[PDB]
Amino acid sequence: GTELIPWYVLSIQADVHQFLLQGATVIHYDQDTHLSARCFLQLQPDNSTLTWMKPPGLVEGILDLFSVKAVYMGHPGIDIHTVCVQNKLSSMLLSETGVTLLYGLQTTDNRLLHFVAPKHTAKMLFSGLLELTTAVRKIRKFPDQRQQWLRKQYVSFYQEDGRYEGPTLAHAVELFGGRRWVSDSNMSFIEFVELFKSFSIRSRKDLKDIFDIYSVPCNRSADLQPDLDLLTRNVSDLLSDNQRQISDAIAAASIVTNGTGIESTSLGIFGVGILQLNDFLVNCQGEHCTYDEILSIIQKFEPNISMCHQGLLSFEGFARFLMDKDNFASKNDESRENKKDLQLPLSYYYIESSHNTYLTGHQLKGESSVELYSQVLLQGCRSIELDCWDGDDGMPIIYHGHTLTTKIPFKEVVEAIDRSAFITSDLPIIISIENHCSLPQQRKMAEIFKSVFGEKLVAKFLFETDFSDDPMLPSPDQLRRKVLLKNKKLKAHYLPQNKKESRQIAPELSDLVIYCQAVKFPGLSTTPKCYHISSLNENAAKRLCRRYSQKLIQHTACQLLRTYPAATRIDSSNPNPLMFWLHGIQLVALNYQTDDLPLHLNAAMFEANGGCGYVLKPPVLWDKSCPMYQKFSPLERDLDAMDPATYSLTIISGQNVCPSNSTGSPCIEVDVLGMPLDSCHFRTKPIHRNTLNPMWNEQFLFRVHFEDLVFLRFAVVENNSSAITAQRIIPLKALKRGYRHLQLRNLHNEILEISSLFINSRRMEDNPSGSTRPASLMFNTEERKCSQTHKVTVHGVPGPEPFAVFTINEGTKAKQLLQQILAVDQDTKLTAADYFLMEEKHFISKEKNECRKQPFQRAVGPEEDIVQILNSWFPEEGYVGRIVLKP
Amino acid sequence: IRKKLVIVGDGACGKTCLLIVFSKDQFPEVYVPTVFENYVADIEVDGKQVELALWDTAGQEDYDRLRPLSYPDTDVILMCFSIDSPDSLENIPEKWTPEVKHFCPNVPIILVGNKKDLRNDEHTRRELAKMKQEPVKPEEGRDMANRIGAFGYMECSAKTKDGVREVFEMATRAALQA
Ligand SMILES: Nc1nc2c(ncn2[C@@H]2O[C@H](COP(=O)(O)OP(=O)(O)OP(=O)(O)O)[C@@H](O)[C@H]2O)c(=O)[nH]1
Ligand SMILES: [Ca+2]
Ligand SMILES: [Mg+2]
């Protein structure tokens, strides 16, 4: 068995999922050979592979549904007429009987698999296939994929030699990183998963130290990722204690250097109760959970029934608590589209863009792919380019002018956009036309746009707000599921130098251009201005930014401005976008065929806000409420007029930081990619011959002034080879506080299942003495501050609960907090003056034998801000705070 | 500098009691069979502060299968037995000595006598009277260690905590040398 796509992920109708499993008779069409044959495709008992054979290659092959990117019905590639004559079948409609599976192993390889079946079979075949691919689409976006890694590895062992059996312990231990070892034999999937868990809990020393400090001797006896998929959580019931002890025993013995050996002493077991866990969330994690929520965590992570019953949390419960998907560094994980951010005009949004979508590699010698437009648009990209040049037969063909790159029909590139433009996202796509076409063909380039896109294409101002005195482009939400094209519009009354578009443009194609009327950049030194979308190569934009940085920011905040790599980059590389994003440039076009750092920043930035491709620009731009509106000059090398928000980062440890390289000396490099004033890099001392669980425990402090746009970058590097093997780029604005795990990724920006990093990241702050103002206060607009809220846990509150969390504004003082606490208890007549908030500091320490030090006491004086004191607690000093109410 | 050791015995003889008392200074109150346990302790011998890692084994048949887990190369492998049971004196050194040699040679061994406190208990004599036995003598303890080629012999008492620290001092020093 071992369903590669588990049942709890699939949402297929029972009947539909049966039809694929039983099998069906369909005709397999091969575009390359252009010859269709009959086949019988069946879905294997594991829901991954599709196999077609001769009914009871052209007629022999297998597809892996983990590579399919999308499924289309009636893809125009299928020649129904050719199939009908070849198979002597009656008249058929391709829009009702064709099925396609765009699959590939890379962003540059997009093959196609064509099936044509009778009308009845097509519906079930396509309907079921769409659900299978949708599940594949989600499974590759889950933040925690430890279990999905085991399924692939176990099944790979299952079918490696052709013999249906599991992996031996020597292989299972080796795969997980344990010692390279005999006694046992093939192990079922449950025995395999239950061995990985022991490796992820018994190989993390750093989680033992964080447990010893906060533990207490309480004796031993008294739409998101589905919980069943989450390895750590307790409800993943889909073995007696005897087996589990063996599983932990072997795992704890296979680990080499850093391992929480399985200590088992009776009457001397420690735990983290409800109160103890709360002290861990308030200080380190910063999370404020109610009594029930904290208890629910205990009932959800503690494996042992005895511990879980008496509200305790053993090391397995605590260790499994820090490895869950809710304890990952990035907040962008499982981030959904925020319809409130997509209401501002279109000029204020950073828009994902691509430069040469058709090209698949080098931009002077290579192939042009029709389907690379569908591959890119599925990633979420919202802008693409078309170099329509000239049809030898009259129909325009897209390719790189005056070069050897292959030519693809234009008709099949506009179709490629339509079939996959709005599959992932729904926000509008802006198409850029490098229209090197003669007048006669542009008429045949305008019919295609109106014939294919139809309603999606914009033909006239769709909103009354576009007719205002000083109009702004409509909000991306308003233009949902719409297509806009940009190119020169009529004014109504050796390196190839082919950048010059057509001097004359047809009156039909131009009429389609509405909201993006490209024109030559008039300049800053020198219809409404909000429509003209210029397009400047990186050299022209980079040169413009440095000389006129402040001028540009107030220009791109009212009209779009596109940028693409310079012609000198024949290598088909990308420019670093952080230079342009700071100044408000929206469409920073990038070469998606090449995977380098500049392309990971675009992926890192646009994985937020639901992945729609539209991310709002920092409020310092486009906002008149921000006190730093017109004074922001990113290129300045020194600004001592504000106090930055000091950041502290600690690389506690990492796990499996060198996949497929057991022997290595990894060192993690942290680069802060921001302005040239708050950008720096750090290096952790190498740890030799340890990749299963390296533990450096370095600390790095950096100060950031403009924190709205800064990207941390963790990059594992082997000193022996000095070659990166895993990287992850996350904004500092989307980095959770406290002890969190970071999910690394390979060079192709693909998720590494088991690899990750364990870090502690606390955002300190300097005390404002009035001389200078905090950086956060300046850049952050006043309106956005009102949206900020904070939760503070107060002990001793009346009622059975030992404590409760109260939501307060940033400016709330102690005086108000008393009223809120007493407001709830209206039944009893209580006087505010009677009660007074008190602050405690329990001097917990790793050492437990000595008697507990007396908890420090203080009186929170009235008018003193309560959020301010909460930020003064540093558990690094060995004390955990409590806001306790007393008479 | 961190050392490694593995301890074996006759089961229900004080293998787990010896480690808990040494690492916790508390005698266990309730007995629970042990499968596989790992402990870390710090000991100073002859001015050398060396971290000590303890690997706990089991002798039960159901747990005999996973013995090789802690076998791989280690600085030292210790031996324990119950003084009250003469059976452990003969079978255990002969049972495990070929196993220890086969799995990991060049590993010095030490023989430890457990349950020393109750050797003089009157109840022991009555219980062994039925089976026609007497408590393991000190003389045979040293001889058995020499027969199996061990570093030395020692006796320990979990309840009285007498001689427990001596074994670790002798054992730890042997690990670094040779
Ligand atoms: N009074 C006394 N009893 C001892 C002494 N040494 C061992 N025992 C007894 O032996 C038992 C030791 O059991 P464990 O601590 O579990 O160690 P074990 O003998 O290996 O048993 P397992 O759990 O199977 O490993 C204790 O319950 C004691 O009753 C001793 O020095 N004095
Ligand atoms: Ca171009
Ligand atoms: Mg035991």
Q: Name the DSSP class of A282.
A: I
Other Cβ atoms less than 10 A from the Cβ of A104: the count is: 16
Which phi and psi (to 5°) does residue A95 adopt? -75, 5
Question: A249 CB near a chain B CB, below 8 Å?
Answer: yes
Q: Name the DSSP class of A656.
A: S
The answer to whether the beta carbons of residues A396 and A441 sit under 8 Å apart is: yes
Compute, in degrees rounded to 10, the torsion defined by CA atoms B120, B126, B132, B135: -10
Question: B27 CB near a chain A CB, below 8 Å?
Answer: no
Q: Which helix (H) or strand (E) holds A824?
A: helix A814-824
In whole angstroms, give the CA distance from residue B80 to residue B96.
11
Compute, in degrees rounded to 10, the torsion defined by CA atoms A309, A315, A318, A320: -100
Residue type, A520: K
Q: Which CATH architecture has domain A788-886?
A: Roll (3.10)
What residues are neighbours of ligand 2 (ion), with CB under 5 Å? A 387, 434
Closest chain A C-alpha to B110 CA, distance in angstroms? 22
- Residues of chain A contacting B34 with CB distance shorter than 8 Å: 264
Six token digits for residue A516? 């993006």
Contact B26 A264 (CB under 8 A): no
Ligand 1, closest atom to CA B59? 24
Which ligand has an atom closest to residue A266 CA?
1
Quote the Cα angle for A462-A467-A471, to 5°: 100
Contact A242 B62 (CB under 8 A): yes
Question: A265 CB near a chain B CB, below 8 Å?
Answer: yes
Nearest CA to ligand 1 atom 31: B115
Contact A261 B26 (CB under 8 A): no
The answer to whether the beta carbons of residues A716 and A668 sit under 8 Å apart is: yes
Ligand 1, closest atom to CA B34? 23
Residue with the two structure tokens 């009959």:
A38
Structural domains of chain B, ranges and CATH numbers in brackets:
2-176 (3.40.50.300)
Contact B66 A268 (CB under 8 A): no
In whole angstroms, give the CA distance from residue A76 to residue A95.
9
In whole angstroms, give the CA distance from residue A75 to residue A29.
12
Ranges of H-type helices in A380-438: 411-420
The answer to whether the beta carbons of residues B56 and B71 sit under 8 Å apart is: no
Nearest CA to ligand 1 atom 7: B14
Six token digits for residue A294? 């904290």
Backbone torsion region of residue A242, taken as left when φ is above 0, otherwise alpha when ψ lies between -120 and 50, otherwise beta:
alpha
Backbone torsion region of residue A761, taken as left when φ is above 0, otherwise alpha when ψ lies between -120 and 50, otherwise beta:
beta
Nearest in space to A586 (alpha carbons), one of A569, A564, A570: A564
Question: B70 CB near a chain A CB, below 8 Å?
Answer: yes
CATH class, domain A341-616, is alpha beta
Residue A461: partners with Cβ closer than 8 Å, 6 or more residues away: A467, A514
The residues spanned by each domain of chain A are: 14-139, 146-327, 341-616, 642-763, 788-886
CATH superfamily of A642-763: C2 domain (2.60.40.150)
Q: Rounded to a whole number, what is the distance in angstroms from the first to the last CA of chain B?
A: 15
Q: Is B145 annotated as a binding residue?
A: no
Q: Return the bridge partners of A30, or none.
A: A35
Nearest in space to B92 (alpha carbons), one of B75, B108, B78: B78
The answer to whether the beta carbons of residues A623 and A629 sit under 8 Å apart is: yes
Residue B137: partners with Cβ closer than 8 Å, 6 or more residues away: none
The answer to whether the beta carbons of residues A8 and A224 sit under 8 Å apart is: no
Nearest in space to A284 (alpha carbons), one of A838, A881, A757, A695: A881
Closest chain A C-alpha to B70 CA, distance in angstroms? 6
Q: Is B150 annotated as a binding residue?
A: no
Residue type, A792: V
Q: Return the bridge partners of A26, or none.
A: A39
Considering only alpha carbons, which residue of chain A is nearest residue B40? A261
List the single best residue of B20, B21, B36 to mutate versus A (max A Cβ within 10 A). Answer: B36
Compute, in degrees rounded to 10, the torsion defined by CA atoms A68, A69, A70, A71: -10
Contact A264 B68 (CB under 8 A): no
Of A252, A253, A267, which has the smallest distance from its Cβ to B29's Cβ? A267
Q: Is B140 annotated as a binding residue?
A: no
Nearest CA to ligand 1 atom 2: B115
In whole angstroms, give the CA distance from residue A538 to residue A626.
29
In whole angstroms, give the CA distance from residue B39 to residue B44.
17
Six token digits for residue A274? 């409800």
Q: Which residues of A are catalytic?
A: 355, 400
Q: Is B10 annotated as a binding residue?
A: yes
Closest chain B C-alpha to A273 CA, distance in angstroms? 22
Which ligand has an atom closest to residue B12 CA?
1
- Residues of chain B contacting A266 with CB distance shorter than 8 Å: 28-30, 32
Contact A267 B28 (CB under 8 A): yes
Q: What value does the CA radius of gyration of chain A take, rounded to a whole number of Å?
A: 30
Which ligand has an atom closest to residue B162 CA?
1
In whole angstroms, give the CA distance from residue B37 to residue A688.
28
Q: What value does the CA radius of gyration of chain B take, rounded to a whole number of Å?
A: 16
Q: Is A787 exposed, middle or buried (0-12, 13-18, 19+ CB in 10 A)?
A: exposed
Which phi and psi (to 5°) does residue A368 adopt? -115, 125
Nearest in space to A878 (alpha carbons), one of A841, A823, A827, A848: A841
Contact B66 A183 (CB under 8 A): yes
Contact B66 A252 (CB under 8 A): no
Interface of A with B in 218-247 (CB under 8 A): 242, 245-246
Question: B131 CB near a chain A CB, below 8 Å?
Answer: no
The answer to whether the beta carbons of residues A201 and A320 sit under 8 Å apart is: yes
Six token digits for residue A22? 């039983």
Q: Rounded to a whole number, what is the distance in angstroms from the first to the last CA of chain A?
A: 64
* 3-state SS class at A163: coil
For strand A587-590 and strand A561-564, is the pairing parallel, antiparallel, or unpaired?
A: parallel
Nearest CA to ligand 1 atom 12: B14
List the single best residue of A169, A201, A242, A266 to mutate versus B (max B Cβ within 10 A). Answer: A266
In whole angstroms, give the CA distance from residue A721 to residue A103.
34
Quote the Cα angle for A693-A699-A704, to 5°: 125
The answer to whether the beta carbons of residues A586 and A350 sit under 8 Å apart is: yes
Q: Is B141 annotated as a binding residue?
A: no
Which phi and psi (to 5°) does residue A103 adopt? -130, 150
Interface of B with A in 74-103 (CB under 8 A): none
Q: Is B116 annotated as a binding residue?
A: yes
Kindly give the interhelix angle for A315-322 and A189-201, rounded to the nearest 10 degrees.
90
The structure's method of determination equals: cryo-EM
Q: Is B178 annotated as a binding residue?
A: no
In whole angstroms, give the CA distance from residue A376 to residue B3.
56
The answer to whether the beta carbons of residues A793 and A805 sit under 8 Å apart is: yes
Nearest CA to ligand 1 atom 25: B34
* 3-state SS class at B141: helix
Q: Which helix (H) or strand (E) holds A668?
A: strand A666-673
From the candidate CATH numbers 2.60.40.1120, 2.30.29.240, 3.40.50.720, 2.115.10.20, the one assigned to the domain spanning A14-139: 2.30.29.240
Q: What is the best residue among B7, B13, B20, B57 to mutate for testing ligand 1's pocket, by most ligand atoms within 8 Å of CB?
A: B13
Nearest CA to ligand 1 atom 28: B14
Which ligand has an atom closest to residue B11 CA?
1
In whole angstroms, give the CA distance from residue A188 to residue A350.
49
Nearest CA to ligand 1 atom 27: B31
- Residues of chain B contacting A208 with CB distance shorter than 8 Å: none
The answer to whether the beta carbons of residues B164 and B21 sit under 8 Å apart is: yes
- Residues of chain A contacting B23 with CB distance shorter than 8 Å: 265
Kindly give the interhelix angle for A241-254 and A189-201, rounded to the nearest 10 degrees.
50
Residue type, A624: K
Ligand 1, closest atom to CA B33? 23
